[PDB]
């Protein structure tokens, strides 16, 4: 079946708990595979130790810049960037997992978890999964955001990997 992966998240060095994500490899296999491998770290790099660097309440929590930790970096398991696989899955509500980008076909490792329906991102960002468990953790992360995206606590993915 589709991969299940996890992110364990700290805020200022204290654990918030675990976010479990289903990756929709049935719809976006290349995008799912990238995220899965970045969670396990099996290519020699990935999300472990990186941060949620941009969090905006009533919008989304963004992470995955494990090279620059500020929204300018990250890389995929294929190369620095890879194409938009498809836009078949939509930003239907809170819990949607989607790829951040810098325009068409600039997927790397940065991703976001929506805390609302973000319908205006349909056809622009590749949705590739959703939150199975840990929306409470996502809401905590969200609460440490701001209008500018600047976080008020240091939000770190302390551990991550594959459950199935
Ligand atoms: N992959 C990805 C996602 C979001 C932003 C960027 C980005 C920005 N400046 C250089 O790269 C890259």
Swiss-Prot record:
Its EC number is 5.2.1.8. The modification S-nitrosocysteine is found at residue 160. Its main location: mitochondrion. The keyword NADP does not apply. The keyword Transit peptide applies. Inhibited by cyclosporin A (CsA). Is displaced by CsA from the mPTP leading to a lower open probability of the mPTP. It is an enzyme of class 5 (isomerase). Acetylated at Lys-124; deacetylated at Lys-124 by SIRT3. One of its GO terms (cellular component) is mitochondrial matrix. One of its GO terms (molecular function) is peptidyl-prolyl cis-trans isomerase activity. The modification N6-succinyllysine is found at residues 24, 43, 132, 147. Associates with the mitochondrial membrane ATP synthase F(1)F(0) ATP synthase; the association is increased by inorganic phosphate (Pi) and decreased by cyclosporin A (CsA). Interacts with ATP5F1B; ATP5PD and ATP5PO. Interacts with SLC25A3; the interaction is impaired by CsA. Interacts with BCL2; the interaction is impaired by CsA. Interacts with TP53; the association implicates preferentially tetrameric TP53, is induced by oxidative stress and is impaired by CsA. Interacts with C1QBP. Interacts with MCUR1. Belongs to the cyclophilin-type PPIase family. PPIase that catalyzes the cis-trans isomerization of proline imidic peptide bonds in oligopeptides and may therefore assist protein folding. Involved in regulation of the mitochondrial permeability transition pore (mPTP). It is proposed that its association with the mPTP is masking a binding site for inhibiting inorganic phosphate (Pi) and promotes the open probability of the mPTP leading to apoptosis or necrosis; the requirement of the PPIase activity for this function is debated. In cooperation with mitochondrial p53/TP53 is involved in activating oxidative stress-induced necrosis. This is Peptidyl-prolyl cis-trans isomerase F, mitochondrial. It comes from Homo sapiens. The lineage of its organism: Eukaryota, Metazoa, Chordata, Craniata, Vertebrata.
């Amino acid at each position: 079946g589709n991969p299940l992966v996890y992110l364990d998240v700290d805020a200022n060095g204290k654990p918030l708990g675990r976010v479990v994500l289903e990756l929709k490899a049935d719809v976006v296999p290349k995008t799912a595979e990238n995220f899965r491998a970045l969670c396990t770290g099996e290519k020699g790099f990935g999300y472990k130790g990186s941060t949620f660097h941009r969090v905006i309440p009533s919008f989304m929590c963004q992470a995955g810049d494990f090279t620059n930790h500020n929204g300018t970096g990250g890389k995929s398991i294929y190369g620095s960037r890879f194409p938009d696989e498809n836009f078949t899955l939509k930003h239907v509500g809170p819990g949607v997992l989607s790829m951040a980008n810098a325009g068409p076909n600039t997927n790397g490792s940065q991703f976001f978890i929506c805390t609302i329906k973000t319908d205006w991102l349909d056809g622009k960002h590749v949705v590739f999964g959703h939150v199975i468990e840990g929306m409470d953790v996502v809401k905590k992360i969200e609460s440490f955001g701001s209008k500018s995206g600047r976080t008020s606590k240091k939000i770190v993915i302390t551990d991550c990997g594959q459950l199935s």
